[PDB]
Amino acid sequence: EPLTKRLSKASRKIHNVSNSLVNARLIALFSDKDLYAKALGCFYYVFVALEAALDEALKKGDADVSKFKDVLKGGLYRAPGFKQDVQHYLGATWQAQLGTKSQALKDYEAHLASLGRSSPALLLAHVYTQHLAMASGGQIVKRWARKIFQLPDDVGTAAFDYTGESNNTLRSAFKKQFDEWGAAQPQELQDQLLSEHLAAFGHNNAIIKAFPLPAT
Numbered sequence: 427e428p429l430t431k432r433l434s435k436a437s438r439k440i441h442n443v444s445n446s447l448v449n450a451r452l453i454a455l456f457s458d459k460d461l462y463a464k465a466l467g468c469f470y471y472v473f474v475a476l477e478a479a480l481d482e483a484l485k486k487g488d489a490d491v492s493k494f495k496d497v498l499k500g501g502l503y504r505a506p507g508f509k510q511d512v513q514h515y516l517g518a519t520w521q522a523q524l525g526t527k528s529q530a531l532k533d534y535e536a537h538l539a540s541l542g543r544s545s546p547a548l549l550l551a552h553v554y555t556q557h558l559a560m561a562s563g564g565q566i567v568k569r570w571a572r573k574i575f576q577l578p579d580d581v582g583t584a585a586f587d588y589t590g591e592s593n594n595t596l597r598s599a600f601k602k603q604f605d606e607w608g609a610a611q612p613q614e615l616q617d618q619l620l621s622e623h624l625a626a627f628g629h630n631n632a633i634i635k636a637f638p639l640p641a642t
Contacts, residue, residue: 429608433623440627447634454639456574463515467524468633470508475535477505479542480549490547497600501591502557510584528636534629551622561593
């Protein structure tokens with residue numbers, strides 16, 4: 427049984443929980459592009475943290491992360507796309523409008539940094555969870571944003587855009603390598619990857635719930 431299938435089976439229940447959480451907040455976010463962009467800003471920081479940790483592992487020549495260099499550095503990365511969208515919607519004072527980071531966000535940032543220092547291979551479980559969802563379900567958020575905010579075809583959804591390598595190719599290439607590499611790892615590390623996959627959902631849900639949504 428491939429690692430991807432073991433992880434996706436284990437995360438089925440929390441994925442459904444996340445799904446409800448996100449959909450329940452979409453209508454609220456789409457009511458105001460500023461609200462939407464502030465919410466994007468949370469995950470701007472998530473992806474800054476994850477991608478900085480990965481870049482650090484690649485620079486150190488981590489045996490495991492380096493094996494993934496081509497699939498990681500070929501269009502999967504999201505932080506520049508998120509930053510483009512946040513600057514687009516919020517303008518000159520975007521950084522102030524993002525407010526203060528929730529404890530939930532700071533905790534995930536700290537966790538990712540710690541993984542980068544002590545066990546960089548476990549970052550790949552968070553890539554599996556975070557980056558591949560952007561390439562997937564993220565396309566639905568993108569379509570709604572463009573419809574409701576009446577966006578030009580080349581502005582406003584850079585967080586969800588894949589203008590070089592296709593989202594489909596990036597996702598399948600990472601999956602294939604993740605499964606091949608994962609199967610060659612000790613059972614303890616495979617279990618840790620499962621745990622970190624679940625943790626990414628947990629962190630994301632915490633960050634989503636901590637976001638201050640106006641009653642209006």
